[PDB]
Ligand binder design. Structure first.
Ligand SMILES: N[C@@H](CCC(=O)N[C@@H](CSSC[C@H](NC(=O)CC[C@H](N)C(=O)O)C(=O)NCC(=O)O)C(=O)NCC(=O)O)C(=O)O
Length: 1444
């Protein structure tokens, strides 16, 4: 018991703690805490082993030990000052006896703490915090009792002792927290490391873990230079994927073998779940502290009313210190509420990083054991979506998982809180929510329907654009850009840009409907209160209630969204459980034994009439039967058989794929294998030869010289640095087979299985390989080798051979017996190089961003203010002003609604009843509805008038410029980068950029009106908000620069995880043939860890920002509450002013954070306008039309061509390729153009079509210089048979005449002349309206050539050019072309460019070209009669001279 006039009640009359509560509870629990935990920690640290790390003794530990020995002196002196009256009180005398033991424990613990730990001990940090707080409360408690009652409750001794006793504890706390221990001067050589430096999270004390201050070192670095992958720290302890997947495998395997009904989700839950049970505790404590602030607001308003009232009655007892203490509790609640929420976010964000790394690494190691058929059940492009999609949805689910119980909890607390203020009137708030929640969930479906519809038209536009960009060479010649531009423009304008406006309207209606509900609940609740209850509606019922209505906004929004992800994640679990249960290879299928010793040894045995099964299910199929087979060292063993017999099955047996039911098999030593179809990995040719082995130069050069590869390296003129694969340059033919054999031979294995490689190559090359590799001559003299082939030479040199058919062996022998006795279609047609060593493992190197940072280094804040003005002029600039005005109107009316509510409450309080309620209520309804209509109008203006006009303008501007670029742009730029801008960058401008400007401006005006409402009541708030603006700018500038570089460095690393999986899916027979599984798993795990070490600091920068921007809001609440109580003393404050001011300040803490988060979404998306405007201003070409010079309709009436000293070059920086050409062609003449390879023949037609400009001279046709003519009027008239045959989708009529200039009769006549009519009619009865698939898959190459000939047939002209078409048109078609030249084109002048001299022997005259100079121009007969002439020498090179 306490012998005191004030009891154990926590709150005194003056508003602070009673003395009995301070002494008996707060300063006792913090003593028992240290007694119980310090002994345990002291034991565990004393049992710990000695370690070599030692810290030097220094002033730190001397100071700590000096300070802690004064506390015992002050408690000692204070314990004698006790008077005779106080010693009969149990709670005060218990205090010193409880404290004095814990001081001795702490003094002991500092000593062992200094030597045996790296980080400041946690219990020491919390004990001194509690003991500073408990003593400061006692100092305040003595002061206010002195001031009001006039006596010292304890003499000046106890006061001055308490004053010293606070300062000593406060000094100990900071000497514990801030300084760091110096290491000894020696044994510090472990700092020398070239790798990344260790992560700073592992050495932070608990106060730095709570405030995230360990992250401040990276922000100063990223602010002053571009980050690159050499700056990132290592991952922490226990984040490695090899560690993580070995936990989950044990639980899943136990799940399958222990019990009858497995499931995957339970195995996931029981291993990672234990942290998400801890996250629920912090979520519940936050949800309880959130709903406390309206109770302190109710208490403060009622205190203002009582203090004004009794003073005014005294004009016609409560202390002022009670007002200053409530304003301090409103700061403490906000500080604790901030401190627990981000410890919830840390624990939920780490579990997604664990789940992703466990599942990805189990999927990869699963794929290496799937049998042939289960691997055949699905697409290679589809198993990769298990990584790209399915684990991504399981990652994103965890951030929402606790809201399934946290959502209803807040809404039940809110309804029960409103029940106590207002009574039975509350129930109208339930019915409106019951009506309007299903309507909103109904509206959320039709948007998803429209959004799924929108995604098709993207693909249709992308396909049309890609098909234009591939065939640009034909478009340039035929002047066909006019139909295809309109064909694209029709699809762009008349579907997609219609569908956008519909989606815009459906978004606007949903924004209105979601805005109006929390107003409508309050208006109906006040309206039902006024007409039924017999009570005055006063200020402290009205202004606390608004905050409780407004807290219902967030849980109503988020409840429908979490259900969608919960349904969506349920399919993915079933897909992964399907995948993990497939059938697996039989382990026992073949034995593996060590090497043989001597050349007589048998290497392999199969016998006892073994049988092997092609499949296990649904019915097993007999692959092999009665097999009895052997092989010996050294000798070449070959096997022959029909295609589709057991030939392939023996090789598949010896690799161990098939299922065994009878017999036995064994293989000695290592196996090297070559697949029949080659597999080429992405990399250098050097690495494809080495394939993970060490480098020995002599054996390497021997291996290359044993193959034809050396000349192939010489011909390409590029060494082993040439990239090869899918994205390298395309090798062809026997080169791949030669490369595969070169890979295999370098391994020096003890058994070779060769699956018929010789079919790909020349026969003399095969002879060369039989000289240098196979037989007794080559390097493989002592290795066993089995080659399955049908080659007569190989079976001639074979030492033993056997015949396999129908799955059974029928004959075998040496070939002498076969020649003599078999009468069969086989006739009736001691030392070696030691194994190469394996290279060692390590880490996968990163790339260097220097290649782009050298351009970026000229500035930071690299997006200029110009691009914002370019986008705001693509939008009509009046519409932006009309968009801005209505945000201000909407916020102004909402503020005036609450000023009217304040006036209504002040009128009700004076009367004690509710007069004129129907008059007062209608104006509040009007001001509340006029604020929703203004929110509707701005969204209609934004979607229909601002955005669609920009999306209309930009694409039309870009396409016109791209379609008129000269050929150099298309030759130098890879098409995979041109198509990206048409596909992704237009999409971000269409759908995502417009929304973030809305969410920026709507939140930015709200805090300006909030600060105006606060400053209008107490004008001294000016001096508070001005120094807080400088910190707000300081933090925003540090976050902006660093976060975008961390996001980019994340993004570039994510793709190479999946390319490796797609590359390895194609090669499982090779990888399993060389036993490279361990290396191929290790590469994948390094690829995962490189991504996670860049994803880890990205999410922690958000927590670092948010703690510091939410701490400003609590100082704003403290300052606004305190200045009103300073104003109350002057006698001027009233209850309505403090209610209106404090109801706004409590709602500001999230907006300050969301503005700075939206600034980076604006800056990320605005780059797309810069990249579009890059291509818009691209360089021009010569004019299409020159109006003053336009030739008559029939201008080429004579086919006469004249050269006037013409010269030209491909590019200005290169040499002249044609020089001083003077040539004259007679009308109707048939000219042969021929010359040596690379002499510059192809430039002639580009000069003729003016695709290249003149450097000197000119070309003249029929008394006009062609340089004066517009390019369309020039290129329209010529006729060309191009060497490239190119097909477009759509009708045959579109492929012949897309302009509809000509009748069907001419079309059918041309098709009749081209022999095409019979084939198309068999395809479809539609005739001309029959449609051709992409790339002309229905047409053979000869059909494409005949189609091009029909295209040339339809165009009337006096001139034709056969521009090198003989490079693809074979003689079986060229005979028809010759007949067509004799019959139809006979009247024309014809220029023919020859692939071979045989095709042009009927030429009237020939021009010989050599190195840009005219060699001779003479008749063929005079050349062929001059045996020493140049053309005669060319015919001798062609062999026609010797032929005749
Ligand atoms: N109070 C929140 C805590 C914060 C929170 O959960 N934030 C979200 C962001 S939702 S962002 C969605 C949006 N928020 C805002 O517009 C900001 C709040 C507002 N301006 C205010 O005045 O409080 C909204 O839903 N507005 C509805 C409304 O206007 O009432 C989150 O999970 N962030 C984790 C992360 O991303 O790291 C809660 O109860 O959980």
């Amino acid at each position: 018991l306490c012998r005191s006039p004030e009891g154990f009640g926590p709150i005194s009359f003056y508003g602070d703690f009673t003395q009995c509560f301070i002494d008996g509870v707060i300063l006792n629990l913090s003593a028992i805490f240290m007694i119980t935990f310090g002994i345990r920690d002291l034991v565990n640290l004393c049992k710990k082993k000695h370690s070599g790390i030692k810290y030097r003794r220094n002033w730190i530990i001397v100071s700590r030990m000096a300070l802690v020995l004064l506390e015992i002196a002050f408690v000692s002196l204070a314990s004698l000052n006790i008077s005779k009256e106080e010693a009969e009180n149990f709670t005060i005398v218990s205090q010193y006896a409880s404290t004095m033991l814990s001081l001795f424990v702490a003094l002991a613990l500092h000593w062992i703490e200094y030597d045996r730990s790296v980080v400041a001990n946690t219990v020491l940090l919390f004990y001194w915090l509690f003991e500073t707080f408990g003593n400061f409360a006692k100092l305040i408690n003595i002061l206010i009792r002195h001031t009001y009652e006039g006596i010292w409750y304890s003499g000046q001794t106890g006061f001055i002792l308490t004053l010293f006793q606070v300062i000593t504890c406060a000094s100990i706390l900071l000497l514990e927290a801030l300084p760091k221990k110096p290491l000894m001067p020696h044994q510090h050589i472990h700092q020398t490391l070239t790798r990344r430096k260790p992560n700073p999270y592992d050495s932070a004390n608990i106060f730095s873990r709570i405030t995230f201050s360990w992250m401040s070192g990276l922000m100063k670095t990223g602010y002053e230079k571009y980050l690159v992958e050499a700056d990132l720290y290592k991952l922490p302890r226990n984040f490695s994927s090899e560690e993580l997947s070995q936990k989950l495998e044990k639980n899943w395997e136990n799940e399958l073998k222990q019990k009858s009904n497995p499931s995957l989700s339970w195995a996931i839950c029981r291993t990672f779940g234990s942290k998400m049970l801890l996250a629920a505790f912090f979520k519940a404590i936050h949800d309880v502290l959130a709903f406390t602030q309206p109770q302190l607001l109710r208490i403060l308003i009622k205190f203002v009313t009582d203090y004004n009232s009794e003073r005014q009655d005294d004009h016609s007892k409560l202390p002022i210190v009670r007002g200053f203490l409530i304003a301090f509790a409103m700061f403490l609640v906000g500080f604790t509420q901030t401190s627990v929420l981000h410890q919830y976010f840390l624990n939920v964000f780490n579990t997604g990083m664990y789940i992703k790394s466990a599942l990805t690494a189990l999927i990869y190691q699963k794929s290496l054991v799937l049998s042939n058929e289960a691997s055949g059940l699905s697409s290679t492009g589809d198993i990769v979506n298990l990584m790209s999609v399915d684990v991504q949805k399981l990652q994103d689910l965890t951030q929402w998982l606790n809201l399934i119980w946290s959502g209803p909890f807040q809404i039940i607390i809110c309804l029960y809180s409103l029940y106590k203020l207002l009574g039975n009137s509350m129930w109208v708030g339930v019915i409106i929510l019951v009506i309007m929640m299903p309507l909103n969930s109904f509206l959320m479906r039709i948007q998803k329907k429209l959004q799924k519809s929108q995604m098709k038209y993207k693909d249709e536009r992308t396909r049309v654009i890609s098909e234009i960009l591939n065939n640009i060479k034909s478009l340039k010649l035929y002047a066909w850009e006019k139909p295809y531009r309109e064909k694209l423009e029709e699809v762009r304008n008349n579907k997609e840009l219609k569908n956008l406006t519909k989606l815009g309207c459906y978004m606007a209606v949903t924004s209105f409907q979601f805005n109006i509900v929390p107003f409508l609940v309050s208006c109906c609740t006040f309206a039902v209160f006024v007409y039924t209850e017999d009570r005055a509606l006063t200020t402290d019922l009205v202004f606390p209630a608004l905050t409780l209505f407004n807290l219902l906004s967030f849980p109503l929004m988020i409840i429908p969204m979490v259900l969608n992800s919960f349904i969506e994640a349920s399919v993915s679990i079933g897909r992964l459980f399907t995948f993990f249960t497939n059938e697996e290879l039989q382990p026992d299928s073949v034995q593996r034994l060590p090497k043989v010793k001597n050349i007589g040894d048998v290497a392999i045995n199969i016998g006892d009439d073994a049988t092997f099964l092609w499949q296990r299910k649904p019915e097993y199929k007999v692959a092999l039967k009665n097999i009895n087979f052997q092989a010996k060292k050294g000798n070449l063993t070959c096997i022959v058989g029909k295609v589709g017999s057991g030939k392939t099955a023996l090789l598949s047996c010896m690799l161990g794929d098939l299922f065994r039911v009878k017999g036995f098999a064994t293989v000695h030593g290592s196996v090297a294998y070559v697949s029949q179809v080659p597999w080429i990995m992405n990399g250098t040719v050097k690495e494809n030869i080495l394939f993970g082995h060490r480098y020995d130069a002599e054996f390497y050069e021997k291996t290359i010289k044993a193959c034809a590869l050396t000349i192939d390296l010489a011909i390409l003129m590029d060494g082993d640095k040439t990239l090869v694969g899918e994205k390298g340059i395309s090798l062809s033919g026997g080169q791949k087979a030669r490369l595969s054999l070169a890979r295999a031979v370098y391994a020096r294995a003890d058994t070779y299985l060769l699956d018929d490689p010789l079919a790909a190559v020349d026969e003399h090359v095969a002879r060369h390989l039989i000289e240098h590799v196979l037989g007794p001559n080559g390097l493989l003299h002592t290795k066993t080798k089995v080659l399955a082939t049908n080659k007569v030479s190989a079976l001639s040199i074979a030492d033993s051979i056997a015949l396999l058919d129908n799955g059974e062996i029928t004959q075998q022998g040496t070939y002498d017996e076969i020649t003599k006795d078999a009468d069969s279609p086989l006739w009736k047609l001691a030392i070696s190089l030691r194994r190469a060593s394996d290279a060692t493992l390590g880490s996968i190197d990163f790339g260097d961003d220097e290649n782009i940072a050298k351009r970026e280094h000229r500035e930071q804040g690299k997006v200029k203010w110009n691009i914002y003005l370019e986008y705001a002029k693509a939008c009509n600039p009046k519409s932006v002003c009309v968009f801005i005005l209505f945000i201000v109107i909407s916020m102004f009316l909402s503020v005036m609604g609450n000023v009217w509510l304040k006036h209504w409450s002040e009128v009700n309080s004076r009367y004690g009843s509710n007069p004129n309620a129907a008059r007062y209520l209608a104006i509040y309804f009007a001001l509340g509805i006029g604020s929703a209509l203004a929110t509707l109008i701005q969204t209609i203006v934004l979607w229909v008038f601002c955005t669609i006009h920009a999306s209309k303008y930009l694409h039309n501007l870009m396409t016109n410029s791209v379609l008129r670029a000269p050929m150099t742009f298309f030759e130098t730029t890879p098409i995979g980068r041109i198509l990206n801008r048409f596909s992704n960058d237009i999409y971000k401008v269409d759908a995502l950029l417009g929304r973030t400007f809305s969410q920026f401006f709507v939140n930015a005006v709200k805090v300006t009106f909030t600060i105006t409402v606060i400053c209008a009541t107490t004008w001294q708030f000016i001096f508070i908000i001005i120094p807080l603006s400088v910190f707000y700018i300081y933090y925003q500038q540090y976050y902006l620069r660093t976060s975008r570089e961390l996001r980019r460095l994340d993004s570039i690393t994510r793709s190479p995880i999946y390319s490796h999986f797609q590359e390895t899916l194609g090669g499982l027979a090779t990888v399993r043939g060389y036993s490279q599984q361990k290396r191929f798993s290790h590469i994948n795990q390094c690829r995962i860890d490189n991504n996670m070490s860049a994803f880890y600091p990205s999410i922690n920068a958000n927590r670092w920002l948010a703690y510091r921007l939410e701490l400003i809001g609590s100082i704003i609440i403290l300052g606004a509450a305190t200045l009103s109580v300073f104003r109350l003393k002057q006698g001027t404050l009233t209850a309505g002013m403090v209610g209106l001011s404090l109801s706004y300040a409590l709602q500001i803490t999230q907006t300050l954070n969301w503005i700075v988060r939206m600034t980076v979404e604006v800056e990320t998306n605005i780059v797309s306008v810069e990249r579009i405007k890059e291509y818009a201003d691209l360089k021009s070409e010569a004019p299409l039309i020159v109006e003053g010079h336009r030739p008559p309709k029939e201008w080429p009436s004579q086919g006469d061509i004249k050269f006037n000293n013409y010269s030209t070059r491909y590019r200005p920086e290169l040499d002249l390729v044609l020089k001083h050409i003077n040539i004259h062609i007679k009308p109707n003449e048939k000219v042969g153009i021929v010359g040596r390879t690379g002499a510059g023949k192809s430039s002639l037609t580009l000069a003729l079509f003016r695709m290249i400009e003149a450097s000197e001279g000119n070309i003249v046709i029929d008394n006009i210089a062609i340089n004066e003519i517009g390019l369309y009027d020039l290129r329209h008239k010529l006729s060309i048979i191009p060497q490239d045959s190119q097909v477009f989708e759509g009708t045959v009529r579109e492929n012949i005449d897309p302009i509809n200039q000509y009748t069907d009769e001419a079309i059918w006549r041309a098709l009749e002349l081209s022999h095409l009519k019979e084939h198309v009619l068999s395809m479809s009865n539609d005739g001309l309206d029959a449609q051709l698939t992409e790339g002309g898959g229905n047409l053979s190459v000869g059909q494409r050539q005949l189609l091009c000939l029909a295209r040339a047939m339809l165009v009337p002209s006096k001139i034709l050019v056969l521009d090198e078409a003989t490079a693809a048109v074979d003689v079986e078609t060229d005979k028809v072309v010759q007949e067509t030249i004799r019959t139809a084109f006979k009247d024309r002048t014809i220029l023919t460019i020859a692939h071979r001299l045989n095709t042009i022997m009927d030429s009237d005259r020939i021009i010989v070209l050599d190195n840009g100079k005219v060699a001779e121009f003479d008749s063929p007969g005079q050349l062929l009669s001059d045996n020493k002439s140049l053309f005669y020498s060319l015919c001798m090179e062609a062999g026609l001279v010797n032929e005749n």
